[PDB]
Amino acid sequence: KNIIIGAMTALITPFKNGKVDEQSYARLIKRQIENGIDAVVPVGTTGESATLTHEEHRTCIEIAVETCKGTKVKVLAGAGSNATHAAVGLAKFAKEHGADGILSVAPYYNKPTQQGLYEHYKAIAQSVDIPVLLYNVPGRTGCEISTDTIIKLFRDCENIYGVKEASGNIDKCVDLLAHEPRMMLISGEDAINYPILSNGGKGVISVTSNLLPDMISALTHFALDENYKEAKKINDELYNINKILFCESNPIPIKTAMYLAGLIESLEFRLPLCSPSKENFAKIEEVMKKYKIKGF
Amino acid sequence: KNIIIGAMTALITPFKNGKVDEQSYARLIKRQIENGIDAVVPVGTTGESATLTHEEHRTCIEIAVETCKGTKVKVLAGAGSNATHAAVGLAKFAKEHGADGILSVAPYYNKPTQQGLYEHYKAIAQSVDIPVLLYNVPGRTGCEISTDTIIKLFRDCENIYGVKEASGNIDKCVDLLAHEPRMMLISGEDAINYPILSNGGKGVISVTSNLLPDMISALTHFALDENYKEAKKINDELYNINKILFCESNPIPIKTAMYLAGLIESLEFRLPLCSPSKENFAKIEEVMKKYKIKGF
Numbered sequence A, B: 001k002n003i004i005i006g007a008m009t010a011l012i013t014p015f016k017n018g019k020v021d022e023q024s025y026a027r028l029i030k031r032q033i034e035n036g037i038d039a040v041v042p043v044g045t046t047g048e049s050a051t052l053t054h055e056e057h058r059t060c061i062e063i064a065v066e067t068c069k070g071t072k073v074k075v076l077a078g079a080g081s082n083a084t085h086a087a088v089g090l091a092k093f094a095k096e097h098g099a100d101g102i103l104s105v106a107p108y109y110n111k112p113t114q115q116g117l118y119e120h121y122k123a124i125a126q127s128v129d130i131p132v133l134l135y136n137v138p139g140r141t142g143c144e145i146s147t148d149t150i151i152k153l154f155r156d157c158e159n160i161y162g163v164k165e166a167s168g169n170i171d172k173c174v175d176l177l178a179h180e181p182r183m184m185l186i187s188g189e190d191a192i193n194y195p196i197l198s199n200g201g202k203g204v205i206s207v208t209s210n211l212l213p214d215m216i217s218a219l220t221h222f223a224l225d226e227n228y229k230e231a232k233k234i235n236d237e238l239y240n241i242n243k244i245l246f247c248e249s250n251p252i253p254i255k256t257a258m259y260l261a262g263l264i265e266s267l268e269f270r271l272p273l274c275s276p277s278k279e280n281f282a283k284i285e286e287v288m289k290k291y292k293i294k295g296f
């Protein structure tokens, strides 16, 4: 199976006067490339996929593909949808426009059954020939891809090579890798990056890496080399920022942090997402002071 | 405040080949009208809003308005979105195409803060002059509209007049009507229709009414006329079918029941939704036998 693993960043999408700041987007991706990141994920949840138009979503995939040409950094395009026909269309766009693979979140709101999730992902995987990473985040979608469904899709669909778990369930991550040790388990939960890697996970899709890509990259590569003392040390040091980046709904804190670090021009969201509270703004600012934030 | 209350049906959307069966759709609405229903809700969750195109969503609103003209039946159009710009667009379409009001679900997946929900709904309410009913279903959206936010929106916006609660939280329904008794609390949870009505709720937006509109209508009208004895009696009798209609994710069981009753031609969903499992198919069929289903 072809895989995309290592340290990866769920890219934020900067806005300027209600439109996608495309130069800031490319500049942010190049900052990720230059700090050891192995792959970037345009237009995930952290990239506000819900409020981008289908055309802006496509533009951001293209910018990511264009920016990473001539580097070893891969593009794992955000292509999830709660409608299978739309998810197939995004997957086909990502394939035809040079993405190295796709991340495909479990359908949200409409709560498909396990059989529906299987058929949903089978239709996506059969539509392209690039690697497909499942994405389970039940707190966001209202549905869970069971371990059995993940393993079945991995074994039945040639290009489905793993899952990005954001479920706070280390038991499930043992379950997954004990029964199917060839799949690529990816951490979608920064605070527990090291435990997931230490059990045989092969990478991270990180929110914190937007702010501290060098630290998340070092953590992941230490862990992949079984240097668990150095990987755990970074994971422990990052715990405070990893948690405060979810004091409000992601990506509200991370965009606040990027703005406070001067890495983005304006602190702009698209409704229903909004600027954080004044208290949380100050709490994000205070935790940042304990970390060294790389510039451009 | 202008309000839309009473017994309301979250209409299923029948498919025929790969498209919406528009004549069956109109036929189902006239069956609802004939069975005492006060309003119909096109393209809600039960109507598979996630997998309809924006054009199909708009078409189903038009058919509902067309069909309910000259009857007392109102159209509370499903107009929710997890992107505020899209929810404003659906709200404005519903106003300009003759809907009596809109149902607007809390944003799903991107999980806005309470402040974001306020601004999301304030932007929608200010975009039209027809009643707006909030819709809280955290099991599916991943977020909750708090009691404080619902009451604030009710008091701050002229056309926001209440909430359809599908949260299994009768405590919250006491909280809502004790602090703001002027709002229209609507049950979005069939099994507990009567308890919500008996506490001062003023209507239901029902899934079971798709199959048994006469029973849900009588239940609501018994309760609003303070005949609690008969309202509870129908609620108790409907419990078995109310529960089996969610043995799998709505609207998979209700569409199965409508197909088994001969009310729709094919048992068709749009992926990721799928026909139910086989023993669940038999359980829906067995519970249906204890109820008298009205034909056309």
Ligand SMILES: NCCCC[C@@](N)(CC[C@](N)(CCCCN)C(=O)O)C(=O)O
Residues within 6 Å of the ligand: A049, A050, A051, A052, A053, A054, A057, A081, A082, A083, A109, B049, B050, B051, B052, B053, B054, B057, B081, B082, B083, B109
């Ligand atoms: N990423 C670019 C497009 C985003 C579209 C959407 N906001 C809404 C998705 C949708 N399936 C739209 C269909 C609604 C038509 N009635 C949904 O709202 O469920 C989402 O996927 O979150």
Ligand SMILES: [Mg+2]
Residues within 6 Å of the ligand: A053, B085
């Ligand atoms: Mg727009």
Ligand SMILES: [Mg+2]
Residues within 6 Å of the ligand: A069, A070, A071
């Ligand atoms: Mg180059």
Ligand SMILES: [Mg+2]
Residues within 6 Å of the ligand: A225
């Ligand atoms: Mg090495």
Ligand SMILES: [Mg+2]
Residues within 6 Å of the ligand: B006, B036, B037, B038
């Ligand atoms: Mg009436």
